[PDB]
Design a protein around this ligand. Structure first.
Ligand SMILES: [K+]
Lengths: 137, 87
């Protein structure tokens, strides 16, 4: 429950490291899990988000691009990670409900991003999410 | 140089900024700087805050003399604050 939310927060951070350092995702994953205090984290789900975003980056971004008013590379780094996480869940995780994916993204954009970030993130997901999940569930 | 008198071969860098674009570019430049000189990078990570401040942490490990030199000549954009510890 909460452990899965903590996994998302950690995935935002670890995905950020991967975007900025351009280290191997596997070294990013290992170092994060080794160094950080992940005592309350659903670690398996953390690993699946990392793997899930890292191996499908271009596909996830593709679900997103039509809905940005700008190029992908003009997006804030944290914004990109949160959205990738959400879109991965929407497209690849049936054990995550529609509302949960969107709301968890909103909360991540609040903790890790700007004042207005969550509004941008929600705006993109409002367009993108129904296309990935037409019944919205 | 101080590196020879340093028990922990690590350069820890903390950034604060109001603009996330500037903090992300600053972070990118720090990483590029470290790697060009043959050092390694742990992180960087963004830290959560409930305010309008953006926070980043980055560790530079296995630094060389040129790493320190290159970091000491690096100009960050105005609006980005920095803390450097050769702990
Ligand atoms: K640990």
């Amino acid at each position: 429950p909460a452990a899965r939310r903590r996994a998302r927060e950690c995935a935002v951070q670890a995905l950020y490291s991967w975007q900025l350092s351009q280290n191997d995702i596997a070294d990013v994953e290992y170092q994060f899990l080794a160094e950080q205090d992940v005592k309350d984290v659903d670690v398996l789900y953390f690993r699946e988000l990392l793997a899930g975003v890292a191996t499908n980056t271009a596909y996830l971004d593709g679900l997103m691009k039509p809905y940005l008013s700008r190029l992908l590379e003009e997006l804030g780094q944290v914004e990109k990670a949160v959205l990738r996480i959400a879109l991965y869940e929407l497209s690849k995780r049936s054990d995550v409900p529609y509302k949960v994916a969107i709301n968890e993204a909103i909360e991540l954009a609040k903790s890790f991003g700007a004042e207005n970030s969550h509004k941008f993130v929600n705006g993109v997901l409002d367009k993108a999410a129904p296309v990935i999940r037409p019944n919205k569930k | 140089g101080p590196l020879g008198s340093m028990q922990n071969q690590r350069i820890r860098i903390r950034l604060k900024a109001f603009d996330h674009r500037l903090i992300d570019q600053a972070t990118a430049e720090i990483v590029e700087t470290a790697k060009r000189t043959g050092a390694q990078v742990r992180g960087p990570i963004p830290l959560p805050t409930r305010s309008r401040t953006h926070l980043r942490l980055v560790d530079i490990v296995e630094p060389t003399e040129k790493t320190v030199d290159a970091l000491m000549r690096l100009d960050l954009a105005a609006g980005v604050d920095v803390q450097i510890s050769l702990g």
